[PDB]
Design a binder for this molecule. Structure first.
Ligand SMILES: Nc1ncnc2c1ncn2[C@@H]1O[C@H](COP(=O)(O)OP(=O)(O)OP(=O)(O)O)[C@@H](O)[C@H]1O
Ligand SMILES: Nc1ncnc2c1ncn2[C@@H]1O[C@H](COP(=O)(O)OP(=O)(O)OP(=O)(O)O)[C@@H](O)[C@H]1O
Ligand SMILES: Nc1ncnc2c1ncn2[C@@H]1O[C@H](COP(=O)(O)OP(=O)(O)OP(=O)(O)O)[C@@H](O)[C@H]1O
Ligand SMILES: Nc1ncnc2c1ncn2[C@@H]1O[C@H](COP(=O)(O)OP(=O)(O)OP(=O)(O)O)[C@@H](O)[C@H]1O
Ligand SMILES: Nc1ncnc2c1ncn2[C@@H]1O[C@H](COP(=O)(O)OP(=O)(O)OP(=O)(O)O)[C@@H](O)[C@H]1O
Ligand SMILES: Nc1ncnc2c1ncn2[C@@H]1O[C@H](COP(=O)(O)OP(=O)(O)OP(=O)(O)O)[C@@H](O)[C@H]1O
Ligand SMILES: [Mg+2]
Ligand SMILES: [Mg+2]
Ligand SMILES: [Mg+2]
Ligand SMILES: [Mo]
Ligand SMILES: [Mo]
Ligand SMILES: [Mo]
Ligand SMILES: [Mo]
Ligand SMILES: [Mo]
Ligand SMILES: [Mo]
Ligand SMILES: [Mo]
Ligand SMILES: [Mo]
Ligand SMILES: [Mo]
Ligand SMILES: [Mo]
Ligand SMILES: [Mo]
Ligand SMILES: [Mo]
Ligand SMILES: [Mo]
Ligand SMILES: [Mo]
Ligand SMILES: [Mo]
Ligand SMILES: [Mo]
Ligand SMILES: [Mo]
Ligand SMILES: [Mo]
Ligand SMILES: [Mo]
Ligand SMILES: [Mo]
Ligand SMILES: [Mo]
Ligand SMILES: [Mo]
Ligand SMILES: [Mo]
Ligand SMILES: [Mo]
Ligand SMILES: [Mo]
Ligand SMILES: [Mo]
Ligand SMILES: [Mo]
Ligand SMILES: [Mo]
Ligand SMILES: [Mo]
Ligand SMILES: [Mo]
Ligand SMILES: [Mo]
Ligand SMILES: [Mo]
Ligand SMILES: [Mo]
Ligand SMILES: [Mo]
Ligand SMILES: [Mo]
Ligand SMILES: [Mo]
Ligand SMILES: [Mo]
Ligand SMILES: [Mo]
Ligand SMILES: [Mo]
Ligand SMILES: [Mo]
Ligand SMILES: [Mo]
Ligand SMILES: [Mo]
Ligand SMILES: [Mo]
Ligand SMILES: [Mo]
Ligand SMILES: [Mo]
Ligand SMILES: [Mo]
Ligand SMILES: [Mo]
Ligand SMILES: [Mo]
Ligand SMILES: [Mo]
Ligand SMILES: [Mo]
Ligand SMILES: [Mo]
Ligand SMILES: [Mo]
Ligand SMILES: [Mo]
Ligand SMILES: [Mo]
Ligand SMILES: [Mo]
Ligand SMILES: [Mo]
Ligand SMILES: [Mo]
Lengths: 245, 268, 245, 268, 245, 268
């Protein structure tokens, strides 16, 4: 059999670092939406890194540093975003928790309170895989590894765009960019262009044991996160290839 | 290519953009600890065997550090196999097994470190950046626990729940990250054979082989973790590894001196 | 007066490492029994080490290592058993907590959730007492020191045998082994043969301030732990010598 | 004054009692690390500029530690300014911003430490009491992260939520606490001018000035954090600081040799 | 605008180290009063240092140590007082929590349980400000910095005297000491004599953003803490100078 | 006896089995730090006395480490007695008092370490395995906090709640565990007398005595913690201890040189 689910009642929500980079204009409505979700779900909220990690990559690459050096430096920016988000939710009983606490004591912390915030980056650190000079196992990937290891009820990725398009909807070829309401990890894995999710996410989807689908939704539109956590189709669904036992 | 081109791409694209990935690949390549050698001391193959195996290797390490800077990582071995059997039987996932295996590599690092302490060689966390001990002739070596940090975030294998990145991968990636000059795996066989020598009477010794050649002969998961062979092909700094028998007196010393003992496995 | 009770409402349960060594066949029924006990009691569940500590003793003794070196190496195996047991109870809100958390923050953790798991070994470590080459202060002893220091309502030891016999019921002289429904720590202390509990346990019983009795029960028989936590006599009662004020 | 008088006061009065405060001031004054120099490497002014700025300073540090014991602290820079902008816009208080800025000084310490590791120079917590590395000719220097520890307990400024004690203050106070002989701030301008040289074409260079004189000319918050000038006036051990341009090759080396490069700012 | 309140529903209570120094005669009634307050308020209880810090200052000053050396040595005595107080409240679910936990996870801990105890000293440590040989940022100051940063509903200081007098009511000039029911931080700041509160407290009051008043009350008189937490005037009110938005 | 016999017993019996206990006792005996001396610097007897007591001992340590490898542990003293009085009066148990006393030994280690830092001697956790500092002529010594780790798991005494294993026991057990060559307790009296010399005018000095002899004369709980005498009788490695007066200039130095100053207390 597939491994058991550890926390079958958990919902995991990954918040893009580029959403946090938009500041109060994006963060305040997201915080109000999360506040209203606290009584409805048991939430692990994980933040990505965003533009400050691009700056530390610029410096670190200019200094010649290897990919394992860059991994924890980017992760730090995801942790800072998590501390910011958690502070905004402190009056509701929400705090940031560290990676070892997420890995070993999440059950007690979600008994103590309704949601906690953590960094979405996984602790690959100096043992990041070589090949690219950019760390491959980033926030989407870390969040998925956790959600799948826990056997969580879902993982929802909250982005600054409606979902996945056929080209970058903010880039050079944006006029030919077409929205994809649904796709599979395998079909995405064989394309070459940019995506709003880590390419490594598609790889960990292939070896997944529990999570069957991940929805990417626009956190800049109030109510889409709430809808997605109820299974409503409001962004791009990514089918992982996992099927029910 | 330019900093400017790179910095502009880093600000304006996804990290998944091919144009950004390519610009990053053109970056300078700094080696953090280029004069060090990483050695893995096997758990099942060496430390689990006790004094007869460990004491001569402790003596070799003490002697070798006079001429060679060493990062010495530990394997896990039979106690980790026991934890994996118990946890797999309960249906626990690879990420939970990964955490359990780390404890056993740490026990082994503690035992080895206690035999080395009077010689000035510490057990450390953060071996790659253990700047002080590695700069002292009185020291010139450290011991570390060989599991990777992934723990609950371990990627599972395609089948089953045994963590696929264990102490061979942990030690290899540290060598790769720190840009070390050499990676030596110390096991209990002379090197790679055409089949498992413990099981096949007429297996033939292989002094030198590439990863592609190993795959073509089905040696992907023999004397090294198979995922290490794939990491090796992607490596920037460590493009070959040497596998030697630590039960043969002086074998480690000879490998550090450039002797072609054991098997050399090349990325290409 | 005797010192005050810190956590008078606490029940402490020590699970033998050799029970955990039996794997799923023993662990799954124990986990289901513990799940049903969560609403009934406030539990500190402490795991012992079992056979992996015998292996690390074999290696460590062959390397000549002193008793203080062996103590933390054995303790690690008790911690791993605790992580395994806690993972099986994660969906009920139970996690493993570290020794400093047990020592200083147990009250908040048992307010957050119904039970937590910890290692039964005490942190004697390199300051283990000399004399024997085998660490004397092991899991039964650690669990008793905690239960008594806290002034807990009880300590129950969950073994792979019915209780204490006059000889090892699985050994050479097993035909003359007779079951002991009740005994005192002092009477046990003066015998010489093997026991299913640490000899040091009898010593810490002699200086105890609160715990008056400890029951050793067979965790391989469903319902005995539940009965013992209600004070029912289903294994061997060990009288510590402590009396009511 | 006597121990006895002091011990009696310490037992019988509030620590706020003037008589106690005065008796304490008469106590002996031990310098913990009197032969060390603390240097701050700017975040925005140096490390954010990458290789062209950092590599020559790494070479200077490696050369300088042959003759000079160094505690090298890092600044924060543009990523901290970004975190402060995001957090201030959310209405978060200074104590929360303080914690965020520390992470950026730590990133910078990690990057610098990785370039220095093969030279034997570690990144440490507890630089002032890093007794071992500072006693070894092979080492003789450490790197630390320059933010102070105050974090949520940071005292806010009189206006706004930007933490007023940042990496200039962190490094200064470490120099002061440990009784170091010298404090050098390494920035990207030659020293202090009569106005911000990046903005004013005819600003005039100031080789030497007191804190009172700076205040009288409105230079309180120019090239150093203004609260540092006030800390400097209260300092027991470090009663002047030197500000130098780290972008000029050899400037740090020259300052360590006693050359009067840059600006010397005196407490009195 | 002023910064937001993080924990607007929090009450902060600082217990003087010299109250704890009185031992059981003072501590037991205080503990019983705190027990009765647990259902009424969400409490962060912070302990000061008291006489043991005077002893470590005596030794440290005789050894010539600088003010940054003395700061953490005094803080340790406040932490020990916190562990003592927390142990007395353990049976009510209260534990001591460390400074990083206070700073980043207070919200989850006060969701888990009704009150926690911490050290009132701030972590200035070796970065304590120079000038005086006695660390200026002590327990009253640390407690106020936290209460104000959190935007707490109050900070109450529990002393061994009725409040602030015009001279030390236990000193040489005690016959001319007159009780001050109300005062402002600015008026206090301009006086020179001794006070029962840190002088640095008056400075952090000047830059405060939320806390408008702090009451100093006698913890040796049962019921004054309870009254003060309801806003009743039973000691000295110190007006900080902050006004409502 | 054989490994095989031992490994079979270790798998098949309880650790309480006499046959297993006996087989384990026949194991080899490795000394981890055989060339080190452990010294305890008293809390009440030395450090609480301030500069007049501490400064000359700091000078002796600095001089002595040229010829002798040292692990220097701190006592607790009057602040711990104060915490024990407060906590005992509240009815708290020995395990809670134990934790409180540790903090005071740590304060004392910090103070001593700050006086030693410029001499290259660090305060450490893990003194016994402080391989690096102990291998360097520039260092050759470390400071540690002398309480044992038992804390809430402290075994109480037969009567009362004062922790019976305090800093004498902490330091002794570290010497024993690490197989050190010598254990010296530095106090404020010349050694052991027939009665407490501070209280009895005609007490007679005892240069040398066994634990059994001490017991027979009722000196079980005089100048050392009584439980230390029992630990000493069970010890594998350190079978005698020396007690010396640290207030006498050069006394520690002389003891390290093999002079028979103070009292030697033997296990047998
Ligand atoms: N095929 C695509 N479909 C949609 N968005 C795309 C695609 N290719 C590139 N993108 C870009 O990805 C951007 C999202 O950026 P990115 O995924 O790096 O941020 P994030 O997820 O917030 O950051 P982090 O991974 O640190 O949490 C979108 O704004 C869009 O411009
Ligand atoms: N084709 C082969 N050639 C040589 N050895 C092989 C081959 N196939 C399998 N092996 C076996 O793999 C073993 C090495 O794996 P093992 O797990 O013992 O190493 P380890 O480094 O000790 O691992 P750990 O350190 O975690 O215990 C050798 O003992 C050998 O029997
Ligand atoms: N007099 C005795 N009465 C009962 N069991 C005995 C006795 N003497 C020896 N034993 C043995 O003790 C065994 C229990 O082993 P042991 O106490 O080591 O395991 P455990 O308590 O599970 O381990 P740990 O102490 O690591 O938690 C029993 O199975 C039995 O064979
Ligand atoms: N009067 C002045 N004279 C010289 N420089 C000035 C003056 N006023 C302002 N400055 C500016 O202050 C800058 C130094 O501040 P900056 O924050 O860059 O230093 P930093 O040490 O790099 O800070 P961090 O390290 O946290 O980034 C100089 O680049 C300079 O432009
Ligand atoms: N003007 C004053 N009004 C009232 N008390 C005063 C005044 N001046 C001095 N004191 C003294 O301050 C004492 C309180 O001592 P202090 O403030 O040091 O203790 P604490 O607050 O318990 O300690 P800590 O600051 O470590 O928590 C009072 O008992 C009183 O003798
Ligand atoms: N028979 C005796 N001979 C010598 N000294 C004795 C004797 N009996 C009692 N003592 C006393 O014991 C004292 C040593 O105990 P003390 O607690 O001062 O040592 P310490 O090492 O300073 O302890 P800590 O370090 O935790 O303070 C000596 O000062 C001495 O007065
Ligand atoms: Mg994205
Ligand atoms: Mg047992
Ligand atoms: Mg006061
Ligand atoms: Mo933590
Ligand atoms: Mo943690
Ligand atoms: Mo960890
Ligand atoms: Mo932790
Ligand atoms: Mo750890
Ligand atoms: Mo923690
Ligand atoms: Mo760990
Ligand atoms: Mo660890
Ligand atoms: Mo260790
Ligand atoms: Mo270690
Ligand atoms: Mo280390
Ligand atoms: Mo370290
Ligand atoms: Mo660690
Ligand atoms: Mo770790
Ligand atoms: Mo760690
Ligand atoms: Mo590191
Ligand atoms: Mo580390
Ligand atoms: Mo180190
Ligand atoms: Mo270090
Ligand atoms: Mo932890
Ligand atoms: Mo912890
Ligand atoms: Mo600890
Ligand atoms: Mo911790
Ligand atoms: Mo600690
Ligand atoms: Mo931190
Ligand atoms: Mo840190
Ligand atoms: Mo690092
Ligand atoms: Mo580091
Ligand atoms: Mo360090
Ligand atoms: Mo360290
Ligand atoms: Mo270290
Ligand atoms: Mo740290
Ligand atoms: Mo830190
Ligand atoms: Mo830390
Ligand atoms: Mo430190
Ligand atoms: Mo530290
Ligand atoms: Mo260090
Ligand atoms: Mo060190
Ligand atoms: Mo902690
Ligand atoms: Mo912590
Ligand atoms: Mo920290
Ligand atoms: Mo922590
Ligand atoms: Mo930390
Ligand atoms: Mo601690
Ligand atoms: Mo500690
Ligand atoms: Mo320290
Ligand atoms: Mo320290
Ligand atoms: Mo250390
Ligand atoms: Mo360390
Ligand atoms: Mo520690
Ligand atoms: Mo500790
Ligand atoms: Mo620790
Ligand atoms: Mo250690
Ligand atoms: Mo340690
Ligand atoms: Mo060390
Ligand atoms: Mo070190
Ligand atoms: Mo070290």
């Amino acid at each position: 059999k597939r491994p058991i689910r550890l926390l079958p009642w958990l919902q995991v929500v990954k918040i893009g670092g580029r959403v946090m980079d938009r500041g109060a204009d994006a963060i305040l409505p997201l915080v109000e939406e999360l506040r209203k979700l606290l009584p409805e779900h048991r939430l692990l909220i994980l933040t990505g890194a965003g533009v400050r990690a691009r700056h530390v990559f610029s410096v670190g690459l200019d200094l010649g540093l290897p990919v394992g050096s860059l991994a924890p430096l980017a992760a730090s920016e995801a942790g800072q975003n998590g501390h910011i988000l958690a502070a905004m939710l402190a009056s509701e009983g929400v705090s940031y928790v560290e990676h070892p606490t997420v890995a070993d004591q999440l059950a007690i912390h979600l008994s103590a309170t309704r949601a906690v915030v953590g960094s979405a980056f996984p602790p690959y650190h100096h043992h990041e895989f070589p090949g690219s000079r950019i760390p491959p196992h980033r926030a989407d990937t870390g969040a998925f590894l956790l959600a799948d290891a826990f056997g969580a009820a879902g993982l929802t990725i909250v982005e600054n765009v409606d979902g996945i398009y056929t080209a970058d909807p903010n880039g050079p070829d944006r006029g030919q960019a077409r929205f994809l309401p649904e796709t599979s990890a395998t079909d995405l894995a064989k394309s070459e262009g940019p995506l709003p999710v880590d390419r490594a996410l598609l790889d960990v989807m292939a070896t997944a044991r529990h999570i069957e689908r991940v929805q990417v939704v626009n956190g800049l539109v109030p109510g889409r996160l709430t809808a997605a956590l109820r299974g409503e189709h409001v962004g791009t669904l990514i089918r992982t290839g996992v099927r029910p036992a | 290519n330019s900093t400017a081109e790179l910095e502009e791409l880093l600000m304006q694209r996804s990290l998944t953009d091919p144009q950004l990935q390519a610009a990053a690949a053109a970056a300078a390549d700094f080696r953090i600890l280029p004069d060090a050698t990483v050695i893995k001391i096997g758990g099942q193959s060496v430390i689990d065997r006790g004094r007869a195996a460990v004491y001569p290797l402790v003596d070799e390490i003490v002697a070798a550090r006079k001429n060679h800077k060493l990062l010495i990582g530990t394997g896990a071995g039979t106690r980790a196999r026991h934890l994996y059997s118990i946890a797999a039987g309960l249906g626990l996932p690879a990420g939970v097994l990964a955490q359990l295996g780390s404890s056993v590599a740490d026990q082994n690092a503690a035992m080895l470190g206690q035999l080395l302490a009077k010689h000035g060689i510490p057990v450390v966390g953060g071996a790659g950046l253990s700047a002080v001990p590695l700069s002292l002739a009185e020291v010139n070596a450290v011991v570390f626990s060989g599991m990777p940090p992934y723990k609950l975030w371990m990627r599972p294998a395609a089948e089953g729940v045994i963590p696929p990145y264990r102490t061979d991968a942990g030690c290899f990636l540290l060598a790769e990250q720190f840009g070390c000059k050499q990676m030596i795996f110390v096991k209990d066989e002379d090197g790679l054979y055409t089949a498992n020598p413990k099981t096949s009477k007429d297996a033939t010794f292989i002094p030198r082989i590439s990863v592609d050649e190993m795959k073509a002969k089905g040696l992907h998961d023999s004397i090294l973790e198979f995922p290490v062979l794939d990491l090796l092909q992607s490596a920037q700094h460590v493009r070959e590894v040497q596998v030697v028998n630590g039960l043969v007196p002086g074998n480690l010393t000879r490998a550090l001196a450039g002797e072609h003992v054991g098997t050399i496995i090349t990325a290409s």
